[PDB]
Design a protein around this ligand. Structure first.
Ligand SMILES: Cc1ncc(COP(=O)(O)O)c(CNCC(=O)O)c1O
Ligand SMILES: Cc1ncc(COP(=O)(O)O)c(CNCC(=O)O)c1O
Lengths: 405, 405
């Protein structure tokens, strides 16, 4: 940086602390990643200065000729990546992508069927303190009590009973592949639209490591910043028949001017995802998650669903008589970042929980491989099995430091 | 830039075209400005990699110690700038800032009183194709047919008749000072909350050139990117009594993870606004707008309300028998960017209009002064009075080029 250090010493010092923090810790928050320098340069561009309400070639402001090229590059690269008939790259976030789809097909008070929030569903999938739960009537389907895999018979029974206008599939903490074909079969049975929120697994979908929801869902929402490794923001994919309605839901519906600099960064991230090395990266993400899962099971940990098919895993800490809150706090003391997370049928509240959620997308981006996954598991074993030992915690800190340099 | 040019030639070429375009044209879109290099550096930082749902010291993710400092710097600088009891610097945009306030105090279907959209009110102030108009019952107050100044007796009559739960004051195209004291007096008469959307005039408010709505309104919303000259995004200011509710409206209410890199850029822009030179800049904005207004009147143009008290002006093109659409198109041919804009009591639809909206915040930022305002007016006079003359248009292009270098 050059102008920030002189203009704003306070902001620059905080940013520099954060940059160093990102290098020194072992980041296992399943929804995070590290973007490239090219993506950051695109978001640090002069495109923030442009008002561009409307869409390419149909704007409400003159002078959009070059930001129109950037938005089209994002839309076309997105379509090549996922094979959707239409893309909307303006959503400011995953929450706004979901909000616009709901605004498109639902009336206030309509019934929506989504994944139980304590079994893996996201906050925007019906939480009562979120707009989704306040605006609409959400009902939930759950996972089997023993396998922790979505119970498709429960999806079907709830759909037939409650007759939702929309069914939402996908999650913030589900470690197994989701069967979009079964979701669409159920939606067709009850005449409901199907929305797939692939935010967590978009990068895996793009690399062919997770079944693509596009061919099965009427609408596909996502964030661009998790496994897709892009700038922070959202995107909506949909069939051509809902294109005009989805575009109008975003604008003039729920947003105003789009973040053109962020859309440029989205295009950049999509170009990166279209390359062969991104496909190799994604395979390493899933391979690392499987390895990490196995290594944790080797340490004596119980995993929700018995392992993982994607980038994330959930540890059920009941066997160690620990809450997720306790485990997150002690791991933070040694330099490992995880988040507490409810497990299916959790006896504890969502503010305490009986689990921790872990993902490998970020450590994979920094170059960690299978041997590092074994060591991370061994460090987590040392800490969680010896929470009252300061010597074990100090050893863990030195082992974390050895991994991050 | 260094990594973008090699990684993505297509995106870099489009951005570079846009950067050069910003220099070569005379930008008079009232809602635009040019941010500093320090602000862009903050948005191009590694802070995009951090999930930070929740607020400083009360996050739902560990590792937020340094992004907490950045958010607090933004909130505290905002409070010093505007004197509000509380600030929320997470809104992704002006639309999301407004959406969260509405989510805080209104139930679906509640009555809201806002400025007539064809007299200056914004799209998020009740348009029927926007969430505001779909979710709530908007009624409107207008400006006097001759003076084009808000008719406060009409505000009061509509409030007493319709008994709104909320009254919204402020606009996207009102060239005169708004009397927040009268708005609060009316709101108190009918027991309504008062919300002031100061997006367009925030920078003028911060420099003491427009009365501050903070002491009169329960809620103040704004964008950070117009006269405030910050990154693209929103902010909510409010009294301490609504602080917890407003914070919960933003999260877990209507958004998810905030854009921490953009919040860092907001803090940077707020630090710039707290400096004496920003106060001198803002005075030049208003001085330039007055000068430009007078110079246009000297060319024979009629201005809505007869001039301006702020950064923007509206030309009523009926005397020249031109629509705003026609004037915007021909000015685009010579390198001058304006937007068509309905005028009060406009006989034409909002897609054609009888006016153009012009603002001086951007040309002031690039260093234009009073002499440049006279020349811009003289160029607009030459073009609009000679729309069928290609020689007049070519002369205008050379004069525009002389101003931008
Ligand atoms: C499945 C899923 N959907 C939407 C969001 C919201 O995105 P945002 O950009 O934060 O508004 C999320 C976010 N999850 C954060 C977390 O999982 O850590 C999500 O998972
Ligand atoms: C008064 C007023 N309020 C909210 C917005 C919305 O902001 P955004 O960041 O675009 O969601 C605006 C925007 N106006 C754009 C225009 O005036 O050109 C506004 O004016």
């Amino acid at each position: 940086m050059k102008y920030l250090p002189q203009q704003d010493p306070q902001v620059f010092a905080a940013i520099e602390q954060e940059r160093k923090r990102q290098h020194a810790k072992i980041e296992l928050i399943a929804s995070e990643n590290f973007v490239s320098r090219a993506v950051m340069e695109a978001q640090g561009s002069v495109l923030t200065n442009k008002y561009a309400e409307g869409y390419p070639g149909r704007r409400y402001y003159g002078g959009c000729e070059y930001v129109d090229i950037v938005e089209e590059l994002a839309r076309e690269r997105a379509k090549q990546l996922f094979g959707a008939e239409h893309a909307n790259v303006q959503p400011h976030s995953g929450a706004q992508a979901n909000m616009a789809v709901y605004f498109t097909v639902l009336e206030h008070g309509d019934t929506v069927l989504g994944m139980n929030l304590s079994h893996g569903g996201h906050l925007t999938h019906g939480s009562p303190v979120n707009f989704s739960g306040v605006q609409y009537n959400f009902v939930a389907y759950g996972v089997d009590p023993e396998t922790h895999v979505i119970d498709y018979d429960d999806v079907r029974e709830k759909a037939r009973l409650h007759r939702p206008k929309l069914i939402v599939a996908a999650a913030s903490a589900y470690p197994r592949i989701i069967d979009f074909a079964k979701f669409r079969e159920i939606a067709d049975e009850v005449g409901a639209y199907l929305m797939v929120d692939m935010a967590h697994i978009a990068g895996l979908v793009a690399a062919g490591l997770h079944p693509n929801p596009v061919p099965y869902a009427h609408f596909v929402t996502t964030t661009t910043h998790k496994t897709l490794r892009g700038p922070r923001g959202g995107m909506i994919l949909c069939q051509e028949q809902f294109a005009k309605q989805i575009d109008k839901a975003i604008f003039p519906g729920i947003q105003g001017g789009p973040l053109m600099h962020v859309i440029a960064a989205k295009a950049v991230a999509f170009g990166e995802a279209l390359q062969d090395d991104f496909k190799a990266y994604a395979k390493r993400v899933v391979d690392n998650a499987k390895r990490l899962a196995s290594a944790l099971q080797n340490e004596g940990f119980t995993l929700v669903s018995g392992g993982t098919d994607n980038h994330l895993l959930l540890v059920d800490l009941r066997p160690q008589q620990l809450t997720g809150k306790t485990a997150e706090k002690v791991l933070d003391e040694v330099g490992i970042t995880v988040n507490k997370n409810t497990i299916p049928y959790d006896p504890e509240s969502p503010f305490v929980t009986s689990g921790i959620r872990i993902g490998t997308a970020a450590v994979t981006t920094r170059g960690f491989g299978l041997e590092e996954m074994d060591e991370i598991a061994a460090i987590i074993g040392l800490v969680l099995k010896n929470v009252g030992s300061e010597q074990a915690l100090e050893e863990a800190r030195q082992r974390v430091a050895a991994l991050t340099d």
